[PDB]
Amino acid sequence: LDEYEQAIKRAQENIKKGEELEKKLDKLERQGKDLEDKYKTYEENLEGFEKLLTDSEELSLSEINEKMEAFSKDSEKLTQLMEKHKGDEKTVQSLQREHHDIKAKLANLQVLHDAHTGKKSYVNEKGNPVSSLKDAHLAINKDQEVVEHEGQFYLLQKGQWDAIKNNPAALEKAQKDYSQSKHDLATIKMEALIHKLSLEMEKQLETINNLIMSTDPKENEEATKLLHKHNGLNLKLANLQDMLAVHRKEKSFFNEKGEEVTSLNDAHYVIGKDQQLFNLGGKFYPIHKEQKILEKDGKFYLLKQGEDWESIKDSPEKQKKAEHDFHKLQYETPMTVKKLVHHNKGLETTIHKERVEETKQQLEDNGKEKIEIANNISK
Amino acid sequence: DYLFKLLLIGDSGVGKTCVLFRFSEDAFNSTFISTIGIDFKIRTIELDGKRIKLQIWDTAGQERFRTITTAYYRGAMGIMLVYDITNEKSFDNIRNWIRNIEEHASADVEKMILGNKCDVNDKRQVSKERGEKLALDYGIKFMETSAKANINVENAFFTLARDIKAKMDK
Numbered sequence: 167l168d169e170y171e172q173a174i175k176r177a178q179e180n181i182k183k184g185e186e187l188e189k190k191l192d193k194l195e196r197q198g199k200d201l202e203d204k205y206k207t208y209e210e211n212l213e214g215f216e217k218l219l220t221d222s223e224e225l226s227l228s229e230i231n232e233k234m235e236a237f238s239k240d241s242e243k244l245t246q247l248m249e250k251h252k253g254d255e256k257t258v259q260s261l262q263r264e265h266h267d268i269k270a271k272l273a274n275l276q277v278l279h280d281a282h283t284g285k286k287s288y289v290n291e292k293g294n295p296v297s298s299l300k301d302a303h304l305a306i307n308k309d310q311e312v313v314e315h316e317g318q319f320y321l322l323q324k325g326q327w328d329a330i331k332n333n334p335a336a337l338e339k340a341q342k343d344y345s346q347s348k349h350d351l352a353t354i355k356m357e358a359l360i361h362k363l364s365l366e367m368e369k370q371l372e373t374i375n376n377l378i379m380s381t382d383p384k385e386n387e388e389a390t391k392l393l394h395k396h397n398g399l400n401l402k403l404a405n406l407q408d409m410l411a412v413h414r415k416e417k418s419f420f421n422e423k424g425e426e427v428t429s430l431n432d433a434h435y436v437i438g439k440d441q442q443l444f445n446l447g448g449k450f451y452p453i454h455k456e457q458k459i460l461e462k463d464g465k466f467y468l469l470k471q472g473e474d475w476e477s478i479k480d481s482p483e484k485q486k487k488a489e490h491d492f493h494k495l496q497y498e499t500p501m502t503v504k505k506l507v508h509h510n511k512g513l514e515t516t517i518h519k520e521r522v523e524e525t526k527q528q529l530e531d532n533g534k535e536k537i538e539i540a541n542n543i544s545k
Numbered sequence: 546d547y548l549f550k551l552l553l554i555g556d557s558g559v560g561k562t563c564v565l566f567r568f569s570e571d572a573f574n575s576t577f578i579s580t581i582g583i584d585f586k587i588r589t590i591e592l593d594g595k596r597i598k599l600q601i602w603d604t605a606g607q608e609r610f611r612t613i614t615t616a617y618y619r620g621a622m623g624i625m626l627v628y629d630i631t632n633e634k635s636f637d638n639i640r641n642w643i644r645n646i647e648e649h650a651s652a653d654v655e656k657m658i659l660g661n662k663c664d665v666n667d668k669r670q671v672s673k674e675r676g677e678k679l680a681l682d683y684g685i686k687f688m689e690t691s692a693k694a695n696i697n698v699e700n701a702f703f704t705l706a707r708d709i710k711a712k713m714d715k
């Protein structure tokens with residue numbers, strides 16, 4: 167009948183779901199091995215990080231010049247915009263900031279360049295010439311030297327030691343100059359690492375593309391293996407940005423217990439210089455140092471630390487502002503890169519099995535379902 | 546058969562990984578799993594009796610993860626710029642995303658703006674009109690989406706594909 171049409175197509179339905187479901191049930195055996203390789207590649211890169219700040223191959227002179235060329239074509243294009251919005255002071259100021267940073271990026275690359283032409287020389291901790299940046303503590307030039315009065319180091323214009331060792335003021339600005347120079351070199355190193363890692367990552371792009379196009383499924387799956395490596399390098403870049411930011415006192419490292427800490431290795435969190443880690447029963451939120459979070463009647467409020475319920479209890483729009491302010495926190499990731507990766511790993515591992523079973527049932531049901539539409543049609 | 550490469554960009558938290566997963570697997574997960582770097586999904590749709598394979602690329606929203614994001618602009622045919630209607634900053638930042646693209650992606654790339662999480666009017670901070678105003682200032686299509694409720698997600702991708710097939714057919 168009508169019914170026969172609606173019964174055959176009531177099993178046309180069921181074999182549509184015997185197949186797009188059995189698709190998922192080995193395609194997940196799939197994705198979990200993917201998940202396995204992904205976190206393995208990630209952890210390798212993370213473990214290999216410290217052992218890369220010291221042992222990475224340097225930027226070639228060619229790479230240095232090429233990255234300086236690129237920055238210059240950015241400083242050029244920056245001024246063009248600066249003189250397009252001439253008069254709009256608040257964007258001209260914005261672009262001046264962007265232009266100043268590039269300028270400083272370039273002064274750093276120039277040090278690297280000057281050392282391949284030296285021009286400048288690398289020097290250890292402290293005084294003596296070295297050949298490799300990994301060994302360098304300072305980069306100085308031809309009319310400067312490092313003297314080591316006791317366990318205390320000094321950076322001065324060459325020869326002028328005698329005009330110095332009897333004036334403490336000048337003993338001081340030269341033990342200061344020394345420090346500032348060690349600092350600047352550290353900055354240069356992190357940026358160099360970042361540039362080096364960037365170049366390496368950009369190169370993998372052509373490759374990844376090919377493996378994707380490749381009709382051979384064996385090659386296709388190899389693009390995913392390679393993406394993991396690509397992203398592993400990105401984990402390293404992220405650490406460096408975080409380090410640079412802390413190094414520049416834009417940010418702060420904190421350990422598991424929200425104690426401020428100096429080094430990445432001890433850090434579980436990384437947040438703004440003017441922020442704190444606020445606890446909401448077993449979870450840290452990055453907020454301003456002079457803010458707090460108040461809970462009342464299952465509601466949450468971000469307020470100045472002065473404020474409390476009384477401050478806003480008669481103001482409705484205050485309350486809603488403090489709730490939107492709190493709501494913006496929700497997807498903040500104050501965690502350190504390594505920590506985030508471990509966090510994400512637990513979340514994905516959990517959810518994978520929560521898709522192992524649900525789909526397994528979804529197949530069990532669709533074969534139970536088979537015993538009904540086979541039943542009806544054989545009538 | 547055509548083959549378009551699509552790029553999702555936008556601040557962390559706005560829902561890029563989620564609209565991707567709704568369009569590609571028709572699934573949504575509330576659990577925040579922040580994106581560490583690029584990956585892609587694949588979906589073949591049908592426009593004008595012709596197959597269109599969509600190769601769709603997710604990116605990392607967190608600043609520390611976007612050092613080389615401009616390098617991904619290469620050979621993107623379309624770019625969805627995503628923000629969160631319940632987060633004004635994420636919306637303000639679209640200006641910068643847009644600029645960054647003008648400077649680093651071909652002037653030819655197709656661009657759609659998506660105000661995601663439109664299923665959360667109880668926490669809205671950006672008016673749908675501010676949305677379309679912005680999109681009109683820049684001359685790019687616009688649309689409010691929800692990856693949770695599956696609102697306008699097929700829509701957004703079909704439209705963007707359309708505008709590429711258009712320009713490409715001719």
Ligand SMILES: Nc1nc2c(ncn2[C@@H]2O[C@H](COP(=O)(O)OP(=O)(O)NP(=O)(O)O)[C@@H](O)[C@H]2O)c(=O)[nH]1
Pocket residue numbers: 497555556557558559560561562563564574575576577578579580581604605606607661662663664665690691692693694
């Ligand atoms: N209510 C609602 N929640 C959503 C929607 N889209 C995403 N979310 C939620 O918002 C969070 C952020 O989603 P996600 O896709 O990870 O955003 P993202 O842009 O990928 N972040 P990142 O750049 O850091 O990877 C997740 O908790 C997700 O469940 C939506 O349309 N509605």
Ligand SMILES: [Mg+2]
Pocket residue numbers: 560561562579580603604605606
């Ligand atoms: Mg994402």
